[PDB]
């Protein structure tokens, strides 16, 4: 449980924050806990007069106490109750967990350092940590975002949004293919996920049904940023992604690309939701070269059963040239949102998750490392791995123990 430090911490914490120019209206009011304590004080022009009277008051003393807790966060496994496995991968696995002090539920992505070392995957693990931190502000509800990162002697841990509903690869195998109306629901939420990423200069690259997870109500998020990169710094030129869901720019060896690659992948994926395979698969051939050449040379071949609105969308998303493709011409994601396929969608209500999802998940049922040492050199690579997202910890506290602990602490101090 969270124990606030005694209110004699105030003067030291105020000097700490003043020296970093963080005792202003813009810095404190924008923070969630800063907003609530300022809101609480006002019930007891605002940039000058009101703000400094708040600084003298012990509602700012309380803000300094919570801030002190924030800055001393040093998570270990001991701070989480880890329950059961809800995902697997090459370097490790994902568990459902409860953070002990607040009781908030999260997904813990636990990667094993010995398995990482053995597969020379150090830069990939660091990359997911970097990519997650870029996309994890703004509390976007259509990406599986990070709140904390930390590591132990033998593990890396990402603390991510919990998704108990399973992925769309799995659900395709049970549900079968989706109708246009049902696909539209997933497209609308996935589009907003990609918009949030593209704003922070992140191209996602691995968009496919397996990376679209469902919550217990059936709303979806883009999951796993291991193959994403920051295209602003240098445009990537590597063939990254999944065969059948890669754009022509990505496949063409040498050619640089940006966010454009995702909109092509969206086309591949939405088709897959309707038809059960990538549009460049043809006869379920497992020949990956046949799949890539069909992508590069031959224009996309759509079945006649598709509505004229859906043809416009897919043909637009699957244009082989970036200069013809939806979401690449100037206005970005907004070009896709304006497609005739989404005529009847209010994108505020998509964002607010008001539309009924077409699949509400049912209920689930219930070595290599031997030899590899872990040197000091290996631990040095993860020196800057630990991280806390201020917004996230504050939002967690706000929705769980803020009022209770504030009340408890007032009794200790009165
Ligand atoms: C389903 N799920 C995945 C799927 N991916 C996954 C799961 C477990 C381990 C790994 C993994 O070992 N990834 C290694 C890897 C593989 C390719 C590229 C980069 C990286 C990494 F960054 F992890 F090094 C991946 N990741 N997070 C979830 C998940 C998130 C929230 N709730 C439920 C599940």
Is residue 212 lining ligand 1, measured as CB closer than 6 Å? no
Residue with tokens 């009781």: 103
Instruction: Tell me how far the alpha carbon of residue 156 lies from the centroid of ligand 1, in angstroms.
Output: 12
Helix pair angle (10-19, 58-71), 10° resolution: 70
Please give the number of the atom of ligand 1 that sits closest to the Cα of 158.
27
Query: Minimal CA–CA distance to 340: which of 318, 370, 311?
Result: 311
For ligand 1, atom 14, the nearest C-alpha belongs to 91
CATH at residue 19: 1.10.287.1270
Is residue 160 lining ligand 1, measured as CB closer than 6 Å? yes
d(CA 294, CA 72): 55
Residue 369 lies in a domain: no
Catalytically annotated residue among 112, 167, 206, 224: 206
Task: Using the 3D structure, point to which of 163, 180, 199 is the last residue of a domain.
Answer: 163
Residues 143 and 274 both lie in one domain: no
Q: Are strands 212-214 and 202-203 parallel, antiparallel or unpaired?
A: unpaired
For ligand 1, atom 19, the nearest C-alpha belongs to 226
Do 197 and 224 touch, CB atoms closer than 8 A? Answer: no
Query: Minimal CA–CA distance to 157: which of 404, 400, 387?
Result: 387
Residue 51 lies in a domain: yes
Is residue 92 lining ligand 1, measured as CB closer than 6 Å? yes
Report CA 406 to chain centroid distance, whole Å: 31
Is residue 144 lining ligand 1, measured as CB closer than 6 Å? yes
- Beta-ladder partners of 227: none
Structure method: X-ray
The dihedral built from the CA positions of residue 108, 128, 386 and 5, taken in this order, carries a sign that is negative
CATH at residue 136: 3.30.200.20
Residue 359 lies in a domain: no
Residue with tokens 């070009």: 335
Residues 332 and 204 both lie in one domain: yes
Residue 381 lies in a domain: no
d(CA 136, CA 215): 18
Residues 45 and 92 both lie in one domain: no
Residue 215 lies in a domain: yes
Residues 344 and 201 both lie in one domain: yes
368 carries an active-site annotation: no
d(CA 279, CA 384): 42
Helix pair angle (58-71, 32-42), 10° resolution: 170
Instruction: List all residues 6 or more positions away from 314 whose beta carbon is below 8 Å from its beta carbon.
Output: 267, 270, 271, 279, 300, 302, 306
Please report, in range form, the residues annotated as the binding site.
86-94, 109
Q: What angle do CA 36, 38, 43 make, to 5 degrees?
A: 95
- Name the CA dihedral angle for 350, 262, 208, 368, rounded to a multiple of 10 degrees: -130
Is residue 321 packed enough to be buried (19+ CB in 10 Å), middle (13-18) or exposed (0-12)? exposed
Residue 372 lies in a domain: no
Residue 331 lies in a domain: yes
Residues 63 and 185 both lie in one domain: no
Residues 178 and 324 both lie in one domain: yes
Residue span of the structural domain in which 119 resides:
78-163
Please give the number of the atom of ligand 1 that sits closest to the Cα of 126.
22
For ligand 1, atom 24, the nearest C-alpha belongs to 125
d(CA 92, CA 114): 10
Instruction: Tell me how far the alpha carbon of residue 94 lies from the centroid of ligand 1, in angstroms.
Output: 7
d(CA 381, CA 173): 40
d(CA 338, CA 80): 44
Instruction: Tell me how far the alpha carbon of residue 63 lies from the centroid of ligand 1, in angstroms.
Output: 36
Helix pair angle (32-42, 390-400), 10° resolution: 50
Report CA 240 to chain centroid distance, whole Å: 19
d(CA 143, CA 357): 17
Residues 243 and 323 both lie in one domain: yes
Please give the number of the atom of ligand 1 that sits closest to the Cα of 163.
32
Query: Minimal CA–CA distance to 251: which of 264, 267, 240?
Result: 240
Residues 110 and 15 both lie in one domain: no
401 φ, ψ (degrees, to nearest 5): -115, 0
HEC letters along the chain: CCCCCCHHHHHHHHHHHHHCCCCCHHHHHHCHHHHHHHHHHHCCCHHHHHHHHHHHCHHHHHHHHHHHHHHCCCCCHHHEEEEEEEEECCCEEEEEEEECCCCCEEEEEEEEHHHHHHCCCHHHHHHHHHHHHHHCCCCCCCECCEEEEEECCCEEEEEECCCCCCEHHHHHHHHCCCCHHHHHHHHHHHHHHHHHHHHCCEECCCCCHHHEEECCCCCEEECCCCCCEECCCCCCCCCCCCCCCCCHHHHCCCCCCCCHHHHHHHHHHHHHHHHCCCCCCCCCCCCHHHHHHHHHCCCCCCCCCCCHHHHHHHHHHCCCCHHHCCCCCCCCHHHHHCCHHHCCCCHHHHHCCCCCCCCCCCCCCCCCCCCCCCCHHHHHCCCCCCEECHHHHHHHHHHHCHHHHHHHHHHHHC
Structure tokens at 183: 């696909």
Do 264 and 248 touch, CB atoms closer than 8 A? Answer: yes
Residues 260 and 187 both lie in one domain: yes
Residues 140 and 188 both lie in one domain: no
337 φ, ψ (degrees, to nearest 5): -60, -35
CATH at residue 246: 1.10.510.10
Please report, in range form, the residues annotated as the binding site for ATP.
86-94, 109
Task: Using the 3D structure, point to which of 134, 163, 192 is the last residue of a domain.
Answer: 163
Residue 193 lies in a domain: yes
Q: What angle do CA 357, 361, 364 make, to 5 degrees?
A: 170
Residues 235 and 259 both lie in one domain: yes
Residues 107 and 62 both lie in one domain: no
CA dist 122 → 10, 115, 182 (Å): 41, 10, 39
Pocket test for ligand 1, best of 83, 97, 109, 212 (most atoms within 8 A of CB): 109
- Beta-ladder partners of 159: 108, 148
Sheet containing 155-160, strands listed edge to edge, beginning at the edge strand earlier in sequence? 80-88, 92-99, 105-112, 155-160, 146-151, 387-388
Query: Minimal CA–CA distance to 69: which of 390, 383, 385?
Result: 390
Rg (the chain; Cα; Å):
24
Do 93 and 87 touch, CB atoms closer than 8 A? Answer: yes
CA dist 32 → 72, 134, 262, 394, 399 (Å): 18, 19, 33, 6, 11
Q: How many domains does the chain have?
A: 3
Structure tokens at 273: 């939701």
Pocket test for ligand 1, best of 82, 83, 88, 90 (most atoms within 8 A of CB): 90
Task: Tally Cβ neighbours within 10 Å of residue 243.
Answer: 18
- Name the CA dihedral angle for 88, 353, 365, 98, rounded to a multiple of 10 degrees: 70
Task: Using the 3D structure, point to which of 108, 133, 163 is the last residue of a domain.
Answer: 163
Do 209 and 172 touch, CB atoms closer than 8 A? Answer: yes
């Amino acid at each position: 449980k969270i124990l606030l430090p005694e209110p004699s911490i105030r003067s030291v914490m105020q000097k700490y924050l003043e020296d970093r120019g963080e005792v202003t209206f813009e810095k404190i009011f924008s923070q969630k806990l800063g907003y609530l304590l300022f809101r609480d004080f006002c019930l007891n022009n605002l940039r000058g007069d009101v703000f400094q009277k708040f600084i003298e008051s012990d509602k700012f003393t309380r803000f300094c106490q919570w801030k002190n807790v924030e800055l001393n966060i040093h998570l270990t496994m001991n701070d989480f109750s880890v329950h059961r496995i809800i995902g697997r991968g090459g370097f490790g696995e994902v568990y459902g967990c409860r953070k002990a002090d607040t009781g908030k539920m999260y997904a813990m992505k636990c990667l094993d350092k010995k398995r990482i070392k053995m597969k020379q995957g150090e830069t990939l693990a660091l990359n997911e940590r970097i990519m997650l931190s870029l996309v994890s502000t703004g509390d976007c509800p259509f990406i599986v975002c990070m709140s904390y990162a930390f590591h132990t002697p033998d593990k890396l841990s990402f603390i991510l949004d919990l998704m108990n509903g399973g992925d769309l690869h799995y659900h395709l195998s049970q549900h079968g293919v989706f109708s246009e109306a049902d696909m539209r629901f997933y497209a609308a939420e996935i589009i907003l996920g990609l918009e949030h990423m593209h704003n922070r200069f992140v191209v996602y690259r691995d968009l496919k049904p397996a990376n679209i997870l469902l919550d217990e109500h059936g709303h979806v998020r883009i999951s796993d940023l291991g193959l994403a990169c920051d295209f602003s710094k240098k445009k990537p030129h590597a063939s990254v992604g999944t065969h059948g869901y890669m754009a022509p720019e990505v496949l063409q060896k040498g050619v640089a690309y940006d966010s454009s690659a995702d909109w092509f992948s969206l086309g591949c994926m939405l088709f897959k939701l309707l038809r059960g395979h990538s549009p460049f698969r043809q006869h379920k051939t497992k020949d990956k070269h046949e799949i890539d050449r069909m992508t590069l040379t031959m224009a996309v071949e759509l079945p006649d059963s598709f509505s004229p609105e859906l043809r416009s969308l897919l043909e637009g998303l699957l244009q082989r040239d970036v200069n013809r493709r939806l979401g690449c011409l100037g206005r970005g994601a907004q070009e896709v949102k304006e497609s005739p396929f989404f005529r009847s969608l209010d994108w505020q209500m998509v964002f607010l998750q008001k539309y009924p999802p077409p699949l509400i998940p049912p209920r689930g049922e219930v070595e290599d490392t031997k030899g590899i040492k872990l040197l000091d050199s290996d631990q040095e690579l993860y020196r800057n791995f630990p991280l806390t997202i201020s917004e996230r910890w504050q939002q967690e506290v706000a929705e769980t123990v803020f009022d209770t602990i504030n009340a408890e602490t007032d009794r200790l101090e009165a």
